[PDB]
Design a protein around this ligand. Sequence first.
Ligand SMILES: COc1ccc2c(=O)[nH]c3sccc3c2c1
Lengths: 193, 197
Amino acid sequence: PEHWTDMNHQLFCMVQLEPGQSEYNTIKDKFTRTCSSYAIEKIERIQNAFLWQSYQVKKRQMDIKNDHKNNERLLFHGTDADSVPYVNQHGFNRSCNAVSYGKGTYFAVDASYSAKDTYSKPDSNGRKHMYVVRVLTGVFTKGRAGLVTPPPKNPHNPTDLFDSVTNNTRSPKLFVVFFDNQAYPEYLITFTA
Amino acid sequence: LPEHWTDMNHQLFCMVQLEPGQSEYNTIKDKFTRTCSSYAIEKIERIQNAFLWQSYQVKKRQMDIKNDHKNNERLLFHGTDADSVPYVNQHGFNRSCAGKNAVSYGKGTYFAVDASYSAKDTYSKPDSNGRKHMYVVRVLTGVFTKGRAGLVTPPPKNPHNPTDLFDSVTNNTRSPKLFVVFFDNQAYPEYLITFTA
Ligand SMILES: COc1ccc2c(=O)[nH]c3sccc3c2c1
């Protein structure tokens, strides 16, 4: 509830951003950093009170666990149009492509990666969909195929887990998280090639 | 955090051994022995997990707002293997780890009305010392329907509104004996029963 606009006591609303204003410009710049050849049709702010409450609880918990670190990253997730309503209302669900770094939900550092047709599948009118996502990446390690949770931070204590996994710890391009409410879909970009 | 919990002194997790003669022990033992009178309880431990409890209580408040005057919470049983007890105590019930049930009503975490069901060796596997383990679990069953093997999420209430979902599924709406839940923090492991033949 920062840039959020009044919901008239609704628990969910999608708010189309005004082009040229501060917020729209901030999100468009994140995308055009690597996707400047695309065409943005609109950016929508996702105001989902329940998803936000659940996410903020996990953030407070991870801030306490990781004795004061920035546990949050702003990442991208391409989806097909038929998945957009579900994610808007319910967020990202690992139980719903290639799971090379584990059976989790995947998020890209670069819009360009999420802009692949394999992730942001064009609909019948050629429109592609990509979320801008607050992700609790926390303390992370290299993933591997078949993980169902992150590995332990010390194998001597096998329930004290990493927060997420990546392809490459030193220069990450993707992150996988394995729990509900570790990812908040903040904006939806509708765009074309 | 509930006022009856042991003071945990800045720590986020503790198991508390209950005393026979306490109402708290006696009620869990009666709920268990109702259908498992042939088994014998070694101990009942109260699970105090601050973070699990916070996430669960947030999901309960949301369901109590969404559903309007529904009894959304049931106290149910879950049999566990000894090797899984440390993970459940710390992190709760993860659908991605769940076994395939003999009668599947969906891919999620299963919870039994009757301790007898959870007491089967298939769920509460005897450890190397012949100890079996069963959780007593606060489950947000909410509004439910008969499930089906294909489900990875609860089904929609209405096929023309795919995102407005049942809270859980059962084997039988008229006479429910099991409940399946498909999301994290919909189940709080409240008590661990250690028992033997
Ligand atoms: C392998 O790394 C990625 C990186 C980014 C993405 C993404 O944006 N959307 C989707 S949808 C299923 C897989 C992915 C994915 C996977």
